[PDB]
Amino acid sequence: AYDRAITVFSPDGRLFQVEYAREAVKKGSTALGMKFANGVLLISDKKVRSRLIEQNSIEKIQLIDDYVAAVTSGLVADARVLVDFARISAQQEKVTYGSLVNIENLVKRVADQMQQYTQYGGVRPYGVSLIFAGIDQIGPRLFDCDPAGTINEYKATAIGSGKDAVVSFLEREYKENLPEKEAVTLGIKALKSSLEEGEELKAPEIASITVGNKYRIYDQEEVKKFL
Amino acid sequence: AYDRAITVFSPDGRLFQVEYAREAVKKGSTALGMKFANGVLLISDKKVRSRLIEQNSIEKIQLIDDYVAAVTSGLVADARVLVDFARISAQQEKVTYGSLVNIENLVKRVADQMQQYTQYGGVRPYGVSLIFAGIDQIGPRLFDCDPAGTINEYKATAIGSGKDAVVSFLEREYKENLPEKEAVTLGIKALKSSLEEGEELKAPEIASITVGNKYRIYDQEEVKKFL
Amino acid sequence: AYDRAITVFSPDGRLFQVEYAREAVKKGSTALGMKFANGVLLISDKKVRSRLIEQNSIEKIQLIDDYVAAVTSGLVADARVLVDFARISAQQEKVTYGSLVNIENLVKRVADQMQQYTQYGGVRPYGVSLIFAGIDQIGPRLFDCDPAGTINEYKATAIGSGKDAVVSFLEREYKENLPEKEAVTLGIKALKSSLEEGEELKAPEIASITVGNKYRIYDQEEVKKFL
Amino acid sequence: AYDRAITVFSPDGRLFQVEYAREAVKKGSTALGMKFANGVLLISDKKVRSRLIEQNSIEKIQLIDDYVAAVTSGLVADARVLVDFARISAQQEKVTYGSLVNIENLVKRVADQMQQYTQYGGVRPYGVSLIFAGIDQIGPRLFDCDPAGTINEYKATAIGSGKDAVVSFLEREYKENLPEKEAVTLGIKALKSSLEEGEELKAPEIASITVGNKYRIYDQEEVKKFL
Amino acid sequence: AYDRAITVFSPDGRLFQVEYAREAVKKGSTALGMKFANGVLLISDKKVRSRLIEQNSIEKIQLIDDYVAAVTSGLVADARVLVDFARISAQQEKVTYGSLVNIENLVKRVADQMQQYTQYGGVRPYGVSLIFAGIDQIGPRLFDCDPAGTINEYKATAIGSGKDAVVSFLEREYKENLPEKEAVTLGIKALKSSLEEGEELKAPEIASITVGNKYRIYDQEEVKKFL
Amino acid sequence: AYDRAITVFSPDGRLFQVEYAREAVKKGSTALGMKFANGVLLISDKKVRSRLIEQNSIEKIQLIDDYVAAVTSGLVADARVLVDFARISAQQEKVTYGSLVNIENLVKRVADQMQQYTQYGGVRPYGVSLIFAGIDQIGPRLFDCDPAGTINEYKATAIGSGKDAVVSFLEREYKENLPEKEAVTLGIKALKSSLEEGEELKAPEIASITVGNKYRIYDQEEVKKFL
Amino acid sequence: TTTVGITLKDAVIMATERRVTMENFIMHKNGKKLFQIDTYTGMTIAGLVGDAQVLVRYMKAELELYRLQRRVNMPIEAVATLLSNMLNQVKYMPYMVQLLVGGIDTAPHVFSIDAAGGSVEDIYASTGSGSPFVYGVLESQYSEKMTVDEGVDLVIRAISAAKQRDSASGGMIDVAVITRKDGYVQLPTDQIESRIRKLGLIL
Amino acid sequence: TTTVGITLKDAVIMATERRVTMENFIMHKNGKKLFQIDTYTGMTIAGLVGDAQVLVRYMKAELELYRLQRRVNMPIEAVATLLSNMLNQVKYMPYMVQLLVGGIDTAPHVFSIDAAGGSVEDIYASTGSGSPFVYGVLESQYSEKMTVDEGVDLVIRAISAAKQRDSASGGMIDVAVITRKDGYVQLPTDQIESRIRKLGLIL
Amino acid sequence: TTTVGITLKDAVIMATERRVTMENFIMHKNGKKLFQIDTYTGMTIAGLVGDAQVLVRYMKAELELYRLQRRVNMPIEAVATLLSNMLNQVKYMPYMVQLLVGGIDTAPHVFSIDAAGGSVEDIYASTGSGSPFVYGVLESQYSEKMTVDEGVDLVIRAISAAKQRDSASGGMIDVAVITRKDGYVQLPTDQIESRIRKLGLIL
């Protein structure tokens, strides 16, 4: 009945077709971000579909520019299209003003594009969530963003199938201003808590940025020291 | 039957799809505004989803310019989009005439954008209500505005889940021309009356403006003195 | 069946969706207009939703220019939008010709906009009726106009819930060329005949214009002398 | 089934939705036209909804130019919109060529506009019939035109509720080249034959034009001499 | 099921909606064309709805230019619209090249317009058939064309209700290169064979053209000599 | 269910609406093409609906230019429209490059136009198959093309009702590099194999082209020598 | 060209001559430069003939349509305000014309309108290359208190003077008189000639 | 043309002359260059008459609409800022005009606006070809402490001086006085003439 | 016109004069050429007044909207880059202006921007027809180590010099001082005059 078009409200004032887009996001790999002392980090799991796949390719952590990065979960083709919108949106701002003073605005622009697809008939929403993490003139930032166009700023958060596991673990364990090394360890520990024991965590992706620096992608060896 | 498209009247001459949009508004946090001696104020509650969220972010009270503010309730992505339409609409008027003589006109423009989406097929309405409060050349103003594009001017009003609680309490308790401090206390008191006892009011937002001044956002400490 | 789209005729040649729009008009406050000696007047009732509302705001009688006014009933957001179309349409005519020779033509333009939305799929009709009253070069004019785009010129008429009460009372009691004061008294009396006794008529709106003058809006004290 | 969209043929090759529009025409007041010696005339009945209505207003016989007039039956708002198309169309032709050599072409343009709305989805037909009567370079002309866009030239015809009554009466009684006065008498007589006895014919409209002259609208006193 | 949109194929590969349009053509008056010695002719019957109709008006045989004519059957408003397209199309070709070398191309253009309306949703087909007859640089031509956009060239053919009667009669009786007078007699005789005896053939239309000449419309007296 | 719109996949990944278009092609007359020593030929059957039809008209074999020809089967109006697209497409290529190096590209353009109508809602596919045969700079070419936009190059093939008969007969009997006369005989023989005995093959169409020449249409006498 | 428009108590008189020249070359001796464009409105044209004639046709159409829609005649000032807007809208690709619009609504009016939409009301005005000569006769001889006969003579003179000294002006004089009573009446030629003879003039 | 606008304690006085010339040719002696465009706002025009007249009509329409929508009069500065935007938007195909806008909101104001949207407020200003002569009188004679009667005389003089030395200026002087108390009041002709006579002047 | 912007340790000082001329004709003696466009940003305008005033309004609107959206003030360099883009986009139909933008973010800045979008930062800059004379005073007298008072005096001198030798410059000098502590503060007229008197100058 009220279930079948993005332009229809339910009698309780719901947009089920958007709620359903949100279920697509649960089917992705788990990723998380968190703030620590003068910085922010991302860590992502990854389905490795086979051993005939190429590892050093289609990365779950994607740089938007040198100081901003995003992880995504949900439909992959949608996620790709949104990350490239995010990059082009970032460059438009830099050309207009010479720099990206507040990352919240990039995020909002991306969130608005998504919101727009929850209002005009003839399109479906993007079945994607994103976490953006970076440094701007306010400081280290960490945002998420869903198919509805909803935005929140966090100290730590996660997206993907293991989201709920990882958020509980962090609700108990997270502290602010950890040093980078401990922050990464807490993160790996949190990620593991979302697996189903027996199942073991292969090489995940880790990026981090600290105030006054550019992003820094951990290579598989450096990542290994935490497994 | 008559329930399923914005362009369809019921046989009693109703637009149910719009009525349904209005239910979305009941799912927001409660917020209220009221006029007092030479000024107007806004107070808003807030869902605090977790302790991993960032407090000093995504505010329920939003400045439209230095002399006008809004609170909103309902679908948050819709609300964000409408606040930014409001801001750009305000600046267009200032560029055209050099100032914003009557806030009612800003509100009407926003309300007209909303009405438009209750008449043309291919779009759904915005599931949002807003309160606008500010000073203009008429004096202190307080308006609300719903998904239908309906507008009213008030001495006091509210929007959100606890609307009916808060409007009764004010129907019994509100007087005009209170000093600021008493108006704020009456507001906190009214807001509490909408909670379900046991449940207690955490730090809410408070902004105020008086004739001849710019808006003034209460910090969490100043707010605390009223809790 | 034939009930659900503005573009569909019933087998008897009816547009029910338009007939349904007409029911929305019955849900408004009652208002009436009448011609008297060298002039015309409007009187409107008003839902006063609360004591927290602001009286000197959102008026049911709206000036279109200095010599033409309108009252409306039905969906309020639709009404607002139509009144502003009416005002811009009036000013276009003045700019083209230097004046508004015949009010019937302003009304027709508004009625044509309304008719248009009863023919093209993808839009619903405006759920609004209007009465226009003013002086032009023919003399004092009084028109009404409904969702269908139908127009009539009257000596006296009404719109809103109490329409039928008020039109009977006037069918019995109206005479032409009354002096202003008696015309206003007949009007208040007619309006009361539509209330449900017990229920009493609070302060209504009253505007009047006479040949060679501009419109004149009665203040609440002047109105009180007739209650 | 085959009943519900202007773009759908029935298996017998019918457009029911157009046939239904043709039923809207039966709900109008009866009007007629007829040719007589060097001229043509129109006569129209009129619903007089009340005594609070203004007589010298919204006329059923409408001039298209000085030498062409129309009467219409059906949805009034549609009819208004068509008569104004008719007028603008007449003037376009006069501006292009300096005059209106053959009225059939005006009528065809109007008929084509109507046909167009019986072929493209997204619009309903105009629920209107018209009679056009005038003098052109061929001579006195009398046409009708329906929601389908169908056109015929007559010596006498009628439209409205009483159509069939009036056409029978004329099938028996009409002769060509009557003098104007007898032609008008026959018309009034025919019109009366369509009423339901008891029911009596109030003041109807009468317009006439003869070769080498402009149209001439009978005033209510002149009309009365025939009642 | 497969019956209700011009864009839908049946599982047997049929377009019923087009087949249905073809039924509209059966409801028209019968007309025929035939080639004879150095020429071609058309003859058309005619519904004479009343004696109040004007005979010398809305002709079933219509000239497209001086050397090409058409008769049509089906929905009259659609036919009118197509004949005018035909005329405008004829003049475009003459302006481009100075003359109309091959009538087949005019017909194809008209036929393509028709086909187009059997492929894109949002329109219905024209419920019309036409016969075109004229002289061009190939010689005397006779074509028909239906709602599907199908075209054939004939020696003789017919369209309308009495089509099948007239085609059989001609299958038995037609010979090529008759003199004009005998061709016309054969035609009248054929036309009569399609009536239902008792029923008798009133004055029909007859046009003819021979090589090196322009068209020639028989007047009602000349036509009478064959009845 | 999955049956009723060109834009819908069945759960097995099929486009039934296109498969149904393919059934329209089976209703056409049988035609075939085959390559022989330094050339290619076409032969087509023909429904001869009556003896009142004109033979030397609407040909099943159609020249696209002097070196390329096509035969088509299915809905005739769609086929006409596609042949003209083919001709215009050929001339565009010749104007751009001065010649048509590879006929496969002409075909692909025609095939792409067809594919396009199997992907966007609001249009149905063309219910047509075509065979194109000609000489280009690669050599003698023979392609077919169906409603789906699918293309194949053949040594021999056929389209129409008798397709399956003619393809079997050729699977058994065809050899490459026959002389023209034997090729034509094999073709006539193949064609006859698809008839239902009793039923006999009237005069069919035969066109042929050899390297270094232009096309050559056999006249009915030359064709007769093979019957 | 010479055209003139004057007002009196309850009347407007408009007159023109008829000559059309391509430079010094007199192509046509009886062009028309005075037109009725409504029951009580007349217009005179000077300037490029094609632009003038197009505007005459629009004003006829639009004033007829207006009258049917409003059931009253366009006020003369409205006619001017319309023209004013039309012409100004296309000022950079203008109608190369000077117009006089004259008529009766509640009173007599004459408006003069330029190719940029400047419109001004006056008790009298003239346009065309002969206008300065006319403005001379009128300055000296016009009176408000003149009668319609006196006024008709006046304009005959003003144009006859213009014709005598403007080679771009010539031919028969046309006059129209617009009154509430009889509407726009174009005086017959034989009457104008009679007055030309009685006033002692030429052409 | 000569127009002037001055401010005083609680009043604005605006005045113009009425002459309209096509070059050296005085086509109309009583054109109108001073218009009320709102309850307490007046506008004077100079420059191309078509462009001026169009803008008068727009300002009337738009200031009336604004008032109905806002339930207050457009602030005078707002009226200037509107005009400023309107004119700048089309600067490369401009309205060839100079405008004065004067009025009372919380105080008196006079703004001067050019064909590029330059707008500047001043205690007084003048425009048109006669403006330098006016600026002379005012420089020498204007006082802030002048009374409304003293001010009216001053402007009558400034324009009379302009008329005496600018052949593009002439005709009757129009004055309007705008005050909170009585709004925009256009002084009657006979009162202006009386003051002209009493001050000892001409035309 | 003469405008100037200088930087010091923790301060920006910006000054202009007020004269507006249509050629040699001094139309207005107190126009405004210095505007605050953000909490810690000021802008000075030179060139076509209509183009300058439009840009003042846009920068006010856009810098206010930016601040609300970002919750921080636009960096001064960002303000310049915005203007740079705006102006270059329309270089072939340009804003005929020279702008100074001055302000405080993490440090003081002054940027100078031309009608093609050229933008350059400098420790000081001047613009308008008087600017060469200013550049003279500054070359000889500016020091980085100057105090805010010394700097205010310096600019008063530079503009006084400009006024004495540029007939397009004149009127009261406006000065604003922009600091982190007190924001953009427009010095009061009576204080500027006092310093003019104490430094021994004129106008």
Q: Find, among G19, G28, G44, the residue nearest to G170 by Cα.
A: G19
Structure tokens at F108: 């692909």
Q: How crowded is the C-beta side of I176, counted as CA atoms within 13 Å?
A: 30
> Using an 8 Å Cβ cutoff, are G12 and G177 in contact?
yes
Cα-Cα-Cα-Cα dihedral of C17, C22, C26, C32, to 10°?
Answer: 170
Chains that touch E (3 or more CB pairs under 8 A): D, F
Q: How crowded is the C-beta side of E22, counted as CA atoms within 13 Å?
A: 14
Measured between beta carbons, the chain A residues lying within 8 angstroms of I72 are: 101-102, 137-138
Catalytic residue among I1, I16, I41, I44: I1
Its sign, for the CA torsion D211, D212, D215, D218, is negative
- Classify domain C1-227 by CATH number: 3.60.20.10
Sheet holding I174-179, edge to edge: I124-127, I3-8, I11-16, I174-179, I183-186
Q: Find, among F127, F156, F128, F130, the residue nearest to F142 by Cα.
A: F156
Residue found under tokens 């409003």: G70
List, in sequence order, every beta strand (DSSP E) within chain C: 31-36, 39-44, 61-65, 68-74, 128-135, 140-145, 151-153, 156-159, 205-210, 216-217
Q: Do I64 and B66 touch (CB under 8 A)?
A: yes
Residues of H numbered 124-183 whose beta carbons fall under 8 angstroms of chain I's beta carbons: which are they? 125, 132
> Using an 8 Å Cβ cutoff, are B110 and H93 in contact?
no
Nearest-neighbour CA in chain I from H186: distance (Å): 26
Helix (H) or strand (E) holding C221: helix C220-224
Helix (H, G, I), strand (E, B) or coil at E92: helix
List, in sequence order, every beta strand (DSSP E) within chain I: 3-8, 11-16, 20-22, 25-28, 34-38, 41-47, 97-104, 108-113, 119-121, 124-127, 174-179, 183-186
Q: How far, CA to CA in Å, does I83 sit from each of H140, I67, I104?
A: 43, 16, 17
Which of B52, B53, B126 to mutate to test binding with chain A, by most A CBs within 10 Å of its CB? Answer: B52
Q: Find, among F104, F105, F110, the residue nearest to F84 by Cα.
A: F110
Structure tokens at H128: 């048109």
Task: Give yes or no: G1 in active site.
Answer: yes
Q: Find, among B69, B104, B105, the residue nearest to B87 by Cα.
A: B69
Q: How far, CA to CA in Å, does F176 sit from each of A4, B136, B154, F37, F166?
A: 59, 93, 93, 7, 16
Which of H88, H92, H121 to mutate to test binding with chain I, by most I CBs within 10 Å of its CB? Answer: H88
For chain G, say whether H54 makes contact (Cβ under 8 Å).
yes
Q: Find, among I190, I150, I156, the residue nearest to I173 by Cα.
A: I156
What are φ and ψ of residue G53, in 5° steps? Answer: -65, -40
Which of I26, I29, I48, I49 to mutate to test binding with chain H, by most H CBs within 10 Å of its CB? Answer: I49
Query: Which residue type sits at I174?
Result: D
- Which top CATH class is I1-203? alpha beta
What are φ and ψ of residue A220, in 5° steps? Answer: -55, -25
Q: Find, among I174, I177, I171, the residue nearest to I202 by Cα.
A: I171
Residue A26 CB contacts under 8 Å (≥ 6 apart), including other chains: A160, A161, A163
What are φ and ψ of residue B184, in 5° steps? Answer: -60, -40
Catalytic residue among H1, H41, H127, H179: H1
For chain A, say whether I72 makes contact (Cβ under 8 Å).
yes
Q: Do E111 and F80 touch (CB under 8 A)?
A: yes
CA distance F165 to F170: 9
Q: Find, among C186, C188, C181, the residue nearest to C205 by Cα.
A: C188
Nearest-neighbour CA in chain E from D48: distance (Å): 30
CA distance E225 to E220: 9
Measured between beta carbons, the chain I residues lying within 8 angstroms of B88 are: 65
Q: Do D155 and E6 touch (CB under 8 A)?
A: no
Q: Report the Cα–Cα distance between both ends of chain G, in Å, rounded.
A: 15
For chain D, say whether E73 makes contact (Cβ under 8 Å).
no
What are φ and ψ of residue C79, in 5° steps? Answer: -60, -45
Q: Do A101 and I71 touch (CB under 8 A)?
A: no
Interface size B-C, in CB pairs within 8 Å, comes to 100
Q: Do G116 and H51 touch (CB under 8 A)?
A: yes
CA distance B114 to I138: 57
Q: How far is C-alpha A27 from the geometric centre of its chain's CA atoms?
A: 14
CB atoms near residue B177 (< 10 Å): 11
Measured between beta carbons, the chain B residues lying within 8 angstroms of I59 are: none
Q: Do chains D and H touch (3 or more CB pairs under 8 A)?
A: no
Its sign, for the CA torsion D145, D146, D149, D155, is negative
Cα-Cα-Cα-Cα dihedral of D112, D118, D123, D124, to 10°?
Answer: 110
Q: How crowded is the C-beta side of A45, counted as CA atoms within 13 Å?
A: 28
Helix (H, G, I), strand (E, B) or coil at B73: strand
Nearest-neighbour CA in chain H from C182: distance (Å): 29
Query: E134: which strand partners?
Result: E68, E141
List, in sequence order, every beta strand (DSSP E) within B49-139: 61-65, 68-74, 128-135
Max CA separation in chain I (angstroms): 48
Residue found under tokens 């400047």: G118
Query: A210: which strand partners?
Result: A39
Helix (H, G, I), strand (E, B) or coil at F109: helix
Helix (H) or strand (E) holding F90: helix F76-97
Structure tokens at I68: 């609300």
Polymer length of chain B: 227
Residue C167 CB contacts under 8 Å (≥ 6 apart), including other chains: C157, C158, D50, D52
For chain I, say whether H117 makes contact (Cβ under 8 Å).
yes
List, in sequence order, every beta strand (DSSP E) within chain D: 31-36, 39-44, 61-65, 68-74, 128-135, 140-145, 151-153, 156-159, 205-210, 216-217
Q: Do B154 and C58 touch (CB under 8 A)?
A: no
**Technique of determination:** X-ray
The residues spanned by each domain of chain H are: 1-203
Nearest CB to F54; choose among E15, E115, E153: E153
**DSSP result, I61-113:** HHHHHHHHHHSSPPPHHHHHHHHHHHHHHTTTS---EEEEEEEESSSEEEEEE
Structure tokens at H184: 């925009």
Helix (H) or strand (E) holding A182: helix A180-192
Q: Do B87 and I65 touch (CB under 8 A)?
A: yes
Query: Which residue type sits at B212?
Result: G
Structure tokens at H202: 């001409």
Q: Do chains G and D touch (3 or more CB pairs under 8 A)?
A: yes
CA distance A169 to G155: 104
CA distance D16 to D93: 34
CA distance C220 to A141: 57
For chain A, say whether I71 makes contact (Cβ under 8 Å).
yes
Residue H152 CB contacts under 8 Å (≥ 6 apart), including other chains: H13, H175, H177, H187, H195
Q: Do G117 and H50 touch (CB under 8 A)?
A: yes
CA distance B73 to C81: 24
Q: Is G39 exposed, middle or buried (0-12, 13-18, 19+ CB in 10 A)?
A: middle
Nearest CB to I28; choose among H84, H117, H120: H120
For chain H, say whether I53 makes contact (Cβ under 8 Å).
yes
CB atoms near residue D199 (< 10 Å): 9
Query: H103: which strand partners?
Result: H41, H109
Find the angle CA(B90)-CA(B96)-CA(B101) to the nearest 5 degrees: 60
Query: F217: which strand partners?
Result: F207
Q: How crowded is the C-beta side of I99, counted as CA atoms within 13 Å?
A: 31
Chains that touch I (3 or more CB pairs under 8 A): A, B, H
Residues of I numbered 181-200 whose beta carbons fall under 8 angstroms of chain A's beta carbons: which are they? none
Q: How far, CA to CA in Å, does B193 sit from each of B26, B168, B207?
A: 17, 9, 20
CA distance G129 to G44: 14
Polymer length of chain C: 227
Helix (H, G, I), strand (E, B) or coil at F209: strand
CA distance F215 to F65: 9
For chain H, say whether B96 makes contact (Cβ under 8 Å).
yes
Three-state DSSP string of H111-145: EEECCCCCEEEECEEEECCCHHHHHHHHHHHCCCC
Q: Is I50 exposed, middle or buried (0-12, 13-18, 19+ CB in 10 A)?
A: buried
Q: Find, among D39, D32, D8, D7, the residue nearest to D181 by Cα.
A: D39
Nearest-neighbour CA in chain I from H125: distance (Å): 8
Q: Report the Cα–Cα distance between both ends of chain F, in Å, rounded.
A: 49
Q: Do B97 and H69 touch (CB under 8 A)?
A: no
Q: How far is C-alpha G132 from the geometric centre of its chain's CA atoms?
A: 15
> Using an 8 Å Cβ cutoff, are A181 and A201 in contact?
no
Residues of E numbered 5-44 whose beta carbons fall under 8 angstroms of chain D's beta carbons: which are they? 5-6, 16-17, 20-27
Nearest-neighbour CA in chain D from E77: distance (Å): 5
Q: Find, among E55, E64, E22, E30, the residue nearest to E150 by Cα.
A: E22
Which residues does a gap of C–N over 2.5 Å follow in chain G?
none
CA distance F120 to F116: 7
Q: Do C52 and B149 touch (CB under 8 A)?
A: no
For chain E, the C-alpha Rg in angstroms (whole number) is 18
Residue D28 CB contacts under 8 Å (≥ 6 apart), including other chains: D72, D73, D74, D129, D159, D160, D161
Residue found under tokens 């001329």: I21
